[PDB]
Ligand binder design. Structure first.
Ligand SMILES: CN(C)CC#Cc1ccc(OCCCc2sc(N3CCc4cccc(C(=O)Nc5nc6ccccc6s5)c4C3)nc2C(=O)O)c(F)c1
Ligand SMILES: CN(C)CC#Cc1ccc(OCCCc2sc(N3CCc4cccc(C(=O)Nc5nc6ccccc6s5)c4C3)nc2C(=O)O)c(F)c1
Lengths: 136, 136
C-alpha cells in the first residue's frame, strides 16, 4: 500500500536527516516513538544490526528472517516502532559505509514486510489512528 | 484463544484416527480441506517434516522457524490448510516413533502459532466463516 510506503519514506528521511544525511499525525507519532525507542529502549533488546551485517549482497530473505525474530511472540505497537527504528539504523549504517544505494532497497524491504506481514494486525487493531492514541 | 485450540485438537484427532491412531461447520471444512491437501497438494511443495526432525528436545522456536518458511510470502487460506496438515503429519510421525507424548505439545505449538501469527489475518479476511464459504 501507498500509505505504508509513505510512512517508511518519511521515517527513514527523518532518521537520515537527524543523523546528518498527509498522515501528518501518524508520521509525527512515529517519529517521536522512534526517538523514544532509540534513547531508552534500543539498548535493552538484542541488537539486530549485529545479526544482519548489511551489504549490497544482502537479500530481502535475510532481512525477513531477522525481522521475524522481532515479532516472534507476535505483533504489538512497540515492536512495530522497533521495526521502523531498525530500518532507520540500517539506512544510517549504510550511508556511513558509503553504500547510500542500499537506502532505497531498505525502504522497499520495510514497505514489503509491512504489507505482507504487519498490515493485517494493524488493521485488526484499529489502524494507525490507534497507534496515535497510544504512542502519540 | 479457545476457538483456535478447539480447531487444532479436532483436526489432529481426526488425522490421527484416519491413520489408525461447536464450530461444527468449521471443523468439517477444515477436515475436508486437510484431506484435499494431502491427496492433491502435499506432493507439490517442499516437505517440511524433513526440516524439523521432531523429538522430545524439539523446541517451539524450531517449529516456528520452519512454519515461517511456509508463510514467507504472506498468508492465505490454502497456506493455513498446509499448516494444519503439517501439524497433523508431525503428530502421526510422533506416534510412529513411540513419542505419543509429543502430540499435546504439537497441539500447543499450533494453537500458539495461530494465535500469535495467523489470527489477525484470519479476522481481517472474514474469519473462519469465510473459509467455510470458500473451502467448505
Ligand atoms: C508515549 N510517549 C512516551 C512516546 C513513546 C514511546 C515508546 C515507549 C516504548 C517503546 O518501546 C517499548 C519496547 C518495544 C518493544 S521492542 C520488543 N522486542 C521484541 C523482541 C525482540 C527480539 C529481538 C530483537 C528485538 C529488537 O527490537 N532489536 C532491535 N535491534 C535494533 C538495532 C537497531 C535499531 C533498532 C533495533 S530494534 C526485539 C524487540 N518488544 C517490545 C514490546 O514492547 O513488547 C517505544 F518504542 C516508544
Ligand atoms: C475446495 N474443496 C475441494 C476443499 C479444498 C481445498 C484446498 C485447496 C487448495 C489447497 O492448497 C492449495 C495450496 C496452498 C498453498 S501451500 C503453499 N506453500 C507455500 C510455500 C511452501 C514452502 C515450503 C513448504 C510448504 C509446505 O506447505 N510444506 C509442507 N510440507 C508438509 C509435510 C507434511 C504435511 C503438510 C505439509 S505442508 C509451502 C507451501 N502455498 C500455497 C498457496 O496456495 O499459496 C488446499 F490445501 C485445500
Amino acid at each position: 500500500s501507498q500509505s505504508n510506503r509513505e510512512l517508511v519514506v518519511d521515517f527513514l528521511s527523518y532518521k537520515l536527516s537527524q543523523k546528518g544525511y498527509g498522515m501528518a499525525a501518524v508520521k509525527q507519532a512515529l517519529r517521536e516513538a522512534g526517538d523514544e525507542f532509540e534513547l531508552r529502549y534500543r539498548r535493552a533488546f538484542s541488537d539486530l544490526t549485529s545479526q544482519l551485517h548489511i551489504t549490497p549482497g544482502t537479500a530481502y530473505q535475510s532481512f525477513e528472517q531477522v525481522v521475524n525474530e522481532l515479532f516472534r511472540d507476535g505483533v504489538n505497537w512497540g515492536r512495530i516502532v522497533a521495526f521502523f527504528s531498525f530500518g532507520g539504523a540500517l539506512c544510517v549504517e549504510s550511508v556511513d559505509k558509503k553504500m547510500q544505494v542500499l537506502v532505497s532497497r531498505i525502504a522497499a524491504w520495510m514497505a514489503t514486510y509491512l504489507n505482507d506481514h504487519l498490515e493485517p494486525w494493524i488493521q485488526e487493531n484499529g489502524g494507525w489512528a490507534t497507534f496515535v492514541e497510544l504512542y502519540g
